[PDB]
Design an enzyme around this catalytic site. Structure first.
Site, PDB file in Angstrom:
ATOM      1  N   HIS A 126       0.834  -1.220   0.000  1.00 32.00           N
ATOM      2  CA  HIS A 126       0.000   0.000   0.000  1.00 32.00           C
ATOM      3  C   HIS A 126       0.852   1.247   0.000  1.00 32.00           C
ATOM      4  CE1 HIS A 126      -3.550  -2.416   0.823  1.00 32.00           C
ATOM      5  NE2 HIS A 126      -2.855  -3.029   1.763  1.00 32.00           N
TER       6      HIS A 126
ATOM      7  N   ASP B  55      -1.489   8.770  -1.517  1.00 34.36           N
ATOM      8  CA  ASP B  55      -1.428   9.970  -2.331  1.00 34.36           C
ATOM      9  C   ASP B  55      -2.357  10.993  -1.687  1.00 34.36           C
ATOM     10  OD1 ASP B  55      -2.155  12.015  -4.319  1.00 34.36           O
ATOM     11  OD2 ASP B  55      -2.256  10.544  -5.934  1.00 34.36           O
TER      12      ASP B  55
ATOM     13  N   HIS C  89      -4.011  14.528  -2.259  1.00 30.51           N
ATOM     14  CA  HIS C  89      -4.270  15.574  -3.249  1.00 30.51           C
ATOM     15  C   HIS C  89      -3.908  16.959  -2.735  1.00 30.51           C
ATOM     16  CE1 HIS C  89      -7.443  13.271  -5.911  1.00 30.51           C
ATOM     17  NE2 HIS C  89      -6.289  12.642  -5.825  1.00 30.51           N
TER      18      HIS C  89
ATOM     19  N   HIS D 154      -5.846   8.973  -1.067  1.00 27.23           N
ATOM     20  CA  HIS D 154      -6.134   7.590  -1.387  1.00 27.23           C
ATOM     21  C   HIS D 154      -4.870   6.784  -1.623  1.00 27.23           C
ATOM     22  CE1 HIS D 154      -5.387   8.086  -5.732  1.00 27.23           C
ATOM     23  NE2 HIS D 154      -5.925   9.279  -5.580  1.00 27.23           N
ATOM     24  N   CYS D 155      -5.027   5.472  -1.539  1.00 21.86           N
ATOM     25  CA  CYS D 155      -3.953   4.575  -1.902  1.00 21.86           C
ATOM     26  C   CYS D 155      -3.818   4.581  -3.402  1.00 21.86           C
ATOM     27  CB  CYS D 155      -4.336   3.209  -1.388  1.00 21.86           C
ATOM     28  SG  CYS D 155      -3.031   1.963  -1.549  1.00 21.86           S
TER      29      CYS D 155
ATOM     30  N   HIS E 218      -7.474  -0.695  -5.366  1.00 27.27           N
ATOM     31  CA  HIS E 218      -7.349  -0.263  -3.964  1.00 27.27           C
ATOM     32  C   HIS E 218      -8.356   0.820  -3.603  1.00 27.27           C
ATOM     33  CE1 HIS E 218      -3.421  -2.238  -2.641  1.00 27.27           C
ATOM     34  NE2 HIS E 218      -3.790  -2.787  -3.786  1.00 27.27           N
TER      35      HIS E 218
ATOM     36  N   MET F 213     -10.044   2.319   0.040  1.00 26.32           N
ATOM     37  CA  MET F 213      -8.812   2.886   0.604  1.00 26.32           C
ATOM     38  C   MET F 213      -8.645   4.359   0.211  1.00 26.32           C
ATOM     39  SD  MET F 213      -5.479   0.652   1.136  1.00 26.32           S
ATOM     40  CE  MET F 213      -4.340   1.315   2.299  1.00 26.32           C
TER      41      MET F 213
ATOM     42  N   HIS G 115     -27.360  16.254  -1.915  1.00 32.43           N
ATOM     43  CA  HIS G 115     -28.579  17.037  -1.718  1.00 32.43           C
ATOM     44  C   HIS G 115     -29.088  16.719  -0.333  1.00 32.43           C
ATOM     45  CE1 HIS G 115     -32.372  18.924  -3.045  1.00 32.43           C
ATOM     46  NE2 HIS G 115     -32.850  18.196  -2.064  1.00 32.43           N
TER      47      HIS G 115
ATOM     48  N   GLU H 156     -29.467  23.702  -4.256  1.00 33.34           N
ATOM     49  CA  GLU H 156     -30.309  22.548  -4.013  1.00 33.34           C
ATOM     50  C   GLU H 156     -29.460  21.279  -4.027  1.00 33.34           C
ATOM     51  OE1 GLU H 156     -33.487  21.751  -7.119  1.00 33.34           O
ATOM     52  OE2 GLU H 156     -32.282  23.134  -8.328  1.00 33.34           O
ATOM     53  N   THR H 157     -28.626  21.183  -5.039  1.00 32.34           N
ATOM     54  CA  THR H 157     -27.830  20.002  -5.307  1.00 32.34           C
ATOM     55  C   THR H 157     -26.529  20.536  -5.936  1.00 32.34           C
ATOM     56  OG1 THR H 157     -29.839  18.752  -5.802  1.00 32.34           O
ATOM     57  CG2 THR H 157     -27.765  17.852  -6.632  1.00 32.34           C
TER      58      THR H 157
ATOM     59  N   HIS I  48     -28.119  12.657  -5.366  1.00 31.21           N
ATOM     60  CA  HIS I  48     -29.381  12.869  -6.046  1.00 31.21           C
ATOM     61  C   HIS I  48     -29.437  12.280  -7.456  1.00 31.21           C
ATOM     62  CE1 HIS I  48     -33.393  14.504  -6.705  1.00 31.21           C
ATOM     63  NE2 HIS I  48     -33.409  14.998  -5.493  1.00 31.21           N
TER      64      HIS I  48
HETATM   65 CU   LIG Z   1      -3.783   0.092  -0.711  1.00 30.59          CU
HETATM   66 CU   LIG Z   2      -6.011  10.893  -6.840  1.00 34.41          CU
HETATM   67 CU   LIG Z   3     -35.109  15.688  -4.631  1.00 37.88          CU
END
Ligand SMILES: [Cu+2]
Ligand SMILES: [Cu+2]
Ligand SMILES: [Cu+2]
Ligand SMILES: [Cu+2]
Ligand SMILES: [Cu+2]
Ligand SMILES: [Cu+2]
Lengths: 333, 333, 333
Positions: free
Chosen positions: C88, C91, C93, C128-129, C138, C143, C248, C272-273, C299
């Site tokens: 494993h 990363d 971001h 994430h891995c 993964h 992960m 939502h 709303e969303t 949604h």
């Molecule tokens: Cu992993």
């Molecule tokens: Cu990424």
């Molecule tokens: Cu709705």
């Protein structure tokens, strides 16, 4: 009177490179002349040797990036040689009227046409083929590209200060729908014409078989990786003519991003990942701060690492341990 | 005290048309009264004659557009006649509390209810049915629409200057999931109730069989194409209650776009294509500059041209050769 | 010189809860120390008893939310115990260089590593891995998690005024691709290693079998529903490491939303969303105005109510009839 304007002829280059241009306009408005030749051709799109009948502007998937300034006129000579078999045309999302030019540019094999339009809105924009009744088949066979309409005074940040790029690349992302038999193997064809009802069936799944940058799995890797140096300012223009994508620079960011590609809007700052809707071009500006390999991906990671939507940057320069360091290298306990 | 406010009764119209309203409010806050009658009915959704059991507000897919101003009260009388078979309700995304009204509006066949809510946030918003345990089935059977809550002083651009539309249309986009047998043909049903486990299976594919504007393939074409004139300012409200869409006016732009539909935010300028997420309404303002036919599409072009998400504008007026012209018409070499 | 900075050790908590932190920084820049232990474990993800081999940071899906301030240094000790079977890494971001840390954090079972990076950009970010050749497997085995980098002076609205939350929750949304046989039943496995080619085949469909909050269908319901009181200001951080989502709050709104999660940008108002692209974290701020149960959903309502992407808030307090009331309760005609 357009006949009183300077004419300038552009000689296009293959993606991901971009023809020469000036960010800040050094002349008044011009008629900028481009020529593209349509080429239907066989393309091998993956490591397994899958071969499709591609439909291209100028021999490449994507078609080349055209660059003008706001209020220039674009004059395109579009050539459909008699060695092709299909009718083609062109729709510019940058243009106003006649289905983006599509209604005025229908060329059979052995024909050419010249379209002019005024580039009234600044931004990056998709262009694509769109023949009546056949639109998604042509687009998803590779027949799309982009055009950049720079503001006459170049790009600006969210405060209205100049942003100047040192390098520019064009990443065209293509969804392909290669027909499969019941067992799951790709059905191969002798002509582009051969595929039609099976092409429609494959498209209707809404599940691409391949999603690639610059026309093939691994196209922007190895000797064809994108390059930069620590401290360089890079603009990456990214288009997707048919389907949403979500670009991400693994190990970097989009410092300034126009996700839907229109420069009269302020950029979004500090993006990890951004959504470019299908039918749109977007642009991201980043200043590299670390050397090494970066992966530039569609961050549906299945689409990236299984289906092909991943490329690399190779960056030269000095490592900055203040920004990142291994304190204790991987080791046993 | 709400009883001291003016009451005004609205008589709704069928989409894509919109009932009469004033952009800038000519009165103080009002209680705006609406009535909708739920109708379960058979609908033919494509050229092949595929028939589904639709669930509608007021007889149409989508349901009609309601228009009020910020800080008005919306009072809806919702009628479920005893000729229907199912329990229904309504969730307004514009409203605050009780699942958007869903918890307070459960009506069996032969019942009605009256809900009031205060329209506290300006924007276009989805409304849809949402009965416990059955939510996506009702929504994807057509039981959704939208409501527009205008600011009391109308729409504004990114600089705070007025934007006034001359015409408004409402495009409801609907994803349908018609069950198929193993060979791929649609399974037909006598009652809405008949479908249930097969409806769930078809939805779980996440692959619509049809995606349509105004309830059917080709609904907004021919004699039912949208219309405008060169120089007219048009607002197009677009909703999708369940699934992302990416509208695009082929041959035009979104001059001002609220992609997620909320008017306290500045609009995005000069859009080619914009993403409206599932569960959202958006709005685009455009001034027509060229006559002719335009296609208004979801710019996943498969979804547009194969699955049904395409409509037309027919625009009258004067062609502008400065904006676009054919320099050399398609011809042989 | 980093050795002159204060060190502070954080003790993480399980999602959807978030470890203690200060919105406005009460110290100068710090090295903030975190420890996570990777755990491969069996997880039951639905009501039917479907069991997968999950890959987790710290025992949970998602991994825990880490919280620092802009220009702090994050120092992570990442432990891969010898009871696991796979290699494993991680990363971030939020970080700059070396594939977000992935190139520097490869740990086999029985190894650990310590990574430091400077949190130069404020926002919520995915981590994430990402082991070479195995990335989507993964990630889609669970992960991934998120990190919040607060501005040193806390959150601000679109006018630059302070926004202060009373409560914060972290909703991690996970797409799973459980392999199925030809009849449609899930294929079960003894080890994580067992699945590989069938895992790839299931991912390549681009159709998740489950989409869940906090690791399982119904995880954020019942005794584990999210809570608030009328008048409380709540920040909901939402991440999706692989696939687009559209959150939502049914019965509410996002009063201030950073859909792509980066706090140097003004928030979008009154949503709303909102669309959070795959590979992104976003954040929504809402002040509750009504008591009762709310559903917090993706949604795409199929993804919510059939595939699992739905949770609940239970809100205490006083009902406001001015905002919403039943005028006439459901009854016969
Ligand atoms: Cu992993
Ligand atoms: Cu990424
Ligand atoms: Cu709705
Ligand atoms: Cu073509
Ligand atoms: Cu187009
Ligand atoms: Cu209903």
């Amino acid at each position: 009177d357009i006949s009183t304007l300077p004419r300038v002829k552009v000689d296009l280059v293959k993606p991901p490179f971009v023809h020469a241009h000036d960010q800040v306009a050094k002349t008044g408005p011009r008629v900028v002349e481009f020529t593209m030749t349509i080429e239907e051709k066989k393309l091998v799109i993956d490591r397994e040797g899958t071969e499709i009948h591609a439909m291209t502007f100028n021999g490449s998937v994507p078609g080349p990036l055209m660059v003008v300034h706001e209020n220039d006129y674009v004059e395109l000579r579009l050539i459909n040689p008699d060695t092709n078999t299909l009718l083609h045309n062109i729709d510019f999302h940058a243009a106003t009227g006649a289905l983006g030019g599509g209604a005025l540019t229908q060329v059979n094999p052995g024909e050419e046409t010249t379209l002019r339009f005024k580039a009234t809105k600044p931004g990056v924009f998709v262009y694509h083929c769109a023949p009546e009744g056949m639109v998604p088949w042509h687009v998803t066979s590779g027949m799309n590209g982009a055009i950049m309409v720079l503001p006459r005074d170049g790009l600006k940040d969210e405060k209205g200060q100049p942003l100047t790029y040192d390098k520019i690349y064009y990443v065209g992302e293509q969804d392909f729908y290669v027909p499969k038999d019941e067992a799951g193997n790709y059905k191969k064809y002798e002509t582009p014409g051969e595929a039609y009802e099976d092409a429609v069936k494959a498209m209707r799944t809404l599940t691409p078989t391949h999603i690639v940058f610059n026309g093939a799995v691994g196209a922007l890797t190895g000797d064809h990786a994108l390059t930069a140096a620590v401290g360089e300012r890079v603009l990456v223009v990214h288009s997707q003519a048919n389907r949403d994508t979500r670009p991400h620079l693994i190990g970097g960011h989009g410092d300034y991003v126009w996700a839907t590609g229109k420069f009269r809007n302020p950029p979004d700052l500090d993006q990890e990942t951004w959504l470019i809707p299908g039918g749109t071009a977007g642009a991201a500006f980043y200043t590299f701060r670390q050397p090494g390999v970066y992966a530039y991906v569609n961050h549906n990671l299945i689409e990236a690492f299984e289906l092909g939507a991943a490329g690399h940057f190779k960056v030269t320069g000095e490592w900055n341990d203040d920004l990142m360091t291994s304190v204790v290298k991987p080791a046993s306990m």
